[PDB]
């Protein structure tokens, strides 16, 4: 009853052009079986959304990657937030929700904005830049590590540890195997940085440790919660900002509308989050026999959710392959959905908005003038290099 496919969603030429294979996954049926890895797959918006909003049946405690934590040892101590179910997930979530609260964005908005404008002034003096190295990577690095309260020496390990975490969600391919057999410089650094003494006062990390008196988390849980924001924050936001600049480079009509109304900068970033989906996939593990899309899935089965394919479903979106900065982007699963929906979505949208804002007010044209290279990862979609010349406004 369930269609079996030989498509490998974690192969290099799937990453090169995933959109043709993603409709084959959508059009094969509401639920497919991927024989390459012995997992169930869901690529339509309706099934992806349903799985994310049923955490008791499609849990996260047994791993949000391919590995079943009930069968294999995790490559690192499990996350107290991402790889946890309610109720153990509830209050560690409530902490990170308050550390990255609306009231917290009020304190960093000016610095995040001024550092975006300063960066968009710095490359305009250069003209021909790399939008990945000098914009998509440079700006979040110039702002988020300071917002965490991190020291200066050792920050070269943050992006490599970011790519390792998302590569380790994938199957035991060479991308995952090679990422792990590097690690422990990145591991030991990220580990060492989560200790309370190395967290500058006022930063996100020092605020997480202060949230141990509250009885929501204990002092031994605080280092892992700091590790989460050091594992999934930089790269997907870097990939997200690199997505929007790419789209404004591909769709000059949308760049012109953003210039005419810089208020659209926040939704322009959100549509780019849906259009590229930096976090492409995430697994869930069935806690019981479940029926979804006429399919009977047994206990302990891995269910792969195609977040990017669900963001391009024509059953849910109108002309989903075109970037529209005015689209009603509400409902996209780029940030997840349900109890696990991204806890730092406010930090990501803040970074993306003020960066597109500075582009909206100071940039006239964004023209590709060099070979565009792609960065391959088991879970992350993003560009390695985006050679661009920025025309000043
Ligand atoms: C473009 C930017 C971002 C994207 C696309 C993104 C994507 C996602 C997705 C899809 C999830 C759900 C994972 C799941 O359900 O298994 C998630 C959760 C999470 N995100 Fe983000 N994220 C972004 C930015 C950030 C930032 C800036 C932070 C922190 C400063 C952050 C921290 C987290 C954490 C800790 C979780 C786990 C929350 C939970 O499991 O309840 N993310 N993110
Ligand atoms: C996307 C993502 C990656 C890692 C984590 C974590 O808890 O470390 C949370 C979310």
UniProtKB/TrEMBL annotation:
Cofactor: heme
Pfam families registered for this protein in UniProt: p450 (PF00067)
InterPro entries for the chain: Cyt_P450, Cyt_P450_B, Cyt_P450_CS, Cyt_P450_sf
Residues the record lists as binding heme b: 89, 93, 284, 340, 342
Alphabetical list of CDD domains matching this protein: CYP199A2-like (cd11037)
GO MF term list: heme binding; iron ion binding; monooxygenase activity; oxidoreductase activity, acting on paired donors, with incorporation or reduction of molecular oxygen
Keywords: Heme, Iron, Metal-binding, Monooxygenase, Oxidoreductase
Keyword Coiled coil: no
Family named by the database record: Belongs to the cytochrome P450 family.
Name this protein carries in UniProt: Cytochrome P450
Natural source organism: Rhodopseudomonas palustris (strain HaA2)
């Amino acid at each position: 009853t369930i269609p079996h496919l030989a498509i490998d969603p974690f192969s290099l030429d799937f990453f090169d052009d995933p959109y043709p294979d993603q409709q084959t996954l959508r059009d094969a049926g509401p639920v497919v079986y991927l024989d390459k890895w012995n997992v169930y797959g869901v690529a339509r918006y309706a099934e992806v959304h349903a799985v994310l909003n049923d955490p008791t049946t499609f849990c996260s405690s047994r791993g949000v990657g391919l590995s079943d934590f009930k069968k294999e040892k995790p490559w690192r101590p499990p996350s107290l937030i991402l790889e946890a179910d309610p109720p153990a997930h509830t209050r560690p979530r409530a902490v990170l929700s308050k550390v990255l609260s609306p009231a917290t964005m009020k304190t960093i908005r000016d610095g995040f904005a001024a550092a975006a404008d300063a960066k968009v002034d710095e490359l305009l003096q250069r003209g021909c830049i790399d939008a990945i190295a000098d914009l998509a990577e440079a700006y979040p690095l110039s702002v988020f590590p300071d917002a965490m309260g991190l020291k200066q020496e050792g920050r070269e390990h943050l992006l490599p540890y970011a790519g390792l975490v998302f590569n380790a969600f994938g199957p035991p391919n060479e991308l995952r195997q090679t990422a792990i057999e590097r690690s422990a410089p990145h591991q030991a650094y990220v580990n060492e940085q989560c200790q309370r003494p190395n967290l500058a006062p006022g930063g996100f990390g020092a605020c997480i440790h202060a949230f141990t008196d509250t009885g929501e988390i204990t002092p031994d849980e605080a280092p892992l919660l700091v590790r989460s924001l050091l594992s999934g924050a930089l790269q997907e936001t870097v990939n997200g900002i690199g997505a929007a600049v790419y789209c404004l480079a591909r769709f000059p009509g949308e760049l012109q509308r953003l210039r005419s109304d810089p208020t659209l900068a926040r939704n322009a970033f959100e549509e780019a989050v849906r259009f590229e989906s930096p976090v492409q996939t995430f697994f869930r593990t069935t806690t019981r026999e479940v029926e979804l899309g006429g399919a009977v899935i047994g206990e302990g089965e891995k269910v792969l959710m195609f977040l990017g394919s669900a963001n391009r479903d024509p059953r849910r979106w109108s002309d989903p392959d075109l970037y529209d900065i005015t689209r009603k982007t509400s409902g996209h699963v780029g940030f997840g959905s349900g109890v696990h929906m991204c806890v730092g979505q406010l930090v990501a949208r803040l970074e993306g908005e003020v960066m597109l804002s500075a582009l909206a007010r100071k940039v006239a044209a964004i023209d590709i003038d060099g070979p565009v290279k792609r960065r391959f990862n088991n879970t992350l979609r993003g560009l390695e290099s985006l050679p661009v010349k920025l025309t000043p406004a």
